[PDB]
Amino acid sequence: GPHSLRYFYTSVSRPGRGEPRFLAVGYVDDTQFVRFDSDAPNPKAEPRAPWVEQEDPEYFHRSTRIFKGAAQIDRGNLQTLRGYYNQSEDGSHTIQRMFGCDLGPDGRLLRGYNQYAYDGADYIALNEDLTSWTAADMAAQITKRKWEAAGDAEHYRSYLEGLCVKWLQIYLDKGKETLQRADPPKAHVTHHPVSAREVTLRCWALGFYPADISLTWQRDGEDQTQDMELVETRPAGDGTFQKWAAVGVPPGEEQRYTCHVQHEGLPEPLTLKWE
Amino acid sequence: TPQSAPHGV
Amino acid sequence: EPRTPKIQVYSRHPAENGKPNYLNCYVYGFHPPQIEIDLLKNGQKMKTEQSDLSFSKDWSFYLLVHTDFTPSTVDEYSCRVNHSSLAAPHMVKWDRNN
């Protein structure tokens, strides 16, 4: 399948309360495997999945050096961005970066990413050619001319076609039993009387990995997406995910309704109903 | 393994 | 400017009175990242763990805040969120059906 290695960098300036705080996390697919926090005493890259504890100390030493670099560079970034937007010193601002690589089934690089946001809005992004940038605005255009003049994209190109694909494959191997084993949803329907006119049929998908899922209701073969309550997929807290879809049905009608579950962990799509 | 931008914005 | 957080409060497992379980508050879609998220037992603040700050494709942040709990007929559980997008803190009651 299409596995991904993604790093998420967040820096927040706190005027008056010292220098900016840097936070980084890394994920393989929907699984967090590292963190870093520049406010930690003697801050280090810390494993957060079982299967990354099985690198040498030097692996964490390396990630630590890079996260300290990213922390420092962002301290300047927040300063130069305040200048670009001609903002005062008093407001807190945010810089975000998301970078990584997608691996398609061939096992070679499908797609590289490296994108930035200032106060949550698009700022600059490496285009999929890995050579040109898309700037969101006149401030980011300054950054685009400077990074194009310096040939910065080659360094992300290097990292991407080299290290990123390499370490993704290492992680997918070391984590085979977790990352490359899909857990199917356990599906059930509950029944929650509301009134003389309405009974809520709730279809539950529990204990599934990865996060991606389709949960639908049909009335006699007829999709109910426009008139069903659907919650955002949510973490169980044990590394699995949850979702539900619900419809208001007239009492007695319950057996007209079928709930459909599709997930890469199911040989067959599940069809189920009340009782 | 992560990566840090050569230069600031 | 700021984006208002969405809030779900739920148990890891279907709730059974007297069976210890894990109470979750998932708060997502917010910006800026500064946020106060507490789990309350009868309006009183519980000891909690918070996930590492991360964010989605659209740059909006998400956190999981969680604790141990034992559901009862006696006790109300709620998640309290305060963020710059809100006039005052929002509280979301835990209901076993949600």
Numbering used by the authors:
A (entry chain A): 6 to 280
B (entry chain C): 1 to 9
C (entry chain B): 1 to 98
Provide the publication's sentences verbatim.
The MHC-I molecule plays a crucial role in antiviral immunity by presenting antigenic peptides to activate specific CD8+ T cells to clear virus-infected cells, while its downregulation can activate NK cells and trigger inflammatory responses. To explore the influence of the 5AA insertion on the structure and function of bat MHC-I, we focused on Mylu-B*67:01.
To examine how the insertion influences the peptide presentation by Mylu-B*67:01, a mutant version of Mylu-B*67:01, named Mylu-B*67:01ΔMQQPW, was created by removing the MQQPW sequence. To explore this hypothesis, the COVID-19 P1 peptide was mutated at the P1-F position, generating P1-T and P1-E mutants that were more compatible with the P1 residue preference of Mylu-B*67:01ΔMQQPW. However, both wild-type and mutant COVID-19 P1 peptides exhibited better binding to Mylu-B*67:01 than Mylu-B*67:01ΔMQQPW. The binding patterns of peptides P1-F and P1-T with both Mylu-B*67:01 and the variant Mylu-B*67:01ΔMQQPW remain largely unchanged, with the primary structural variations localized around the region where the MQQPW sequence has been inserted.
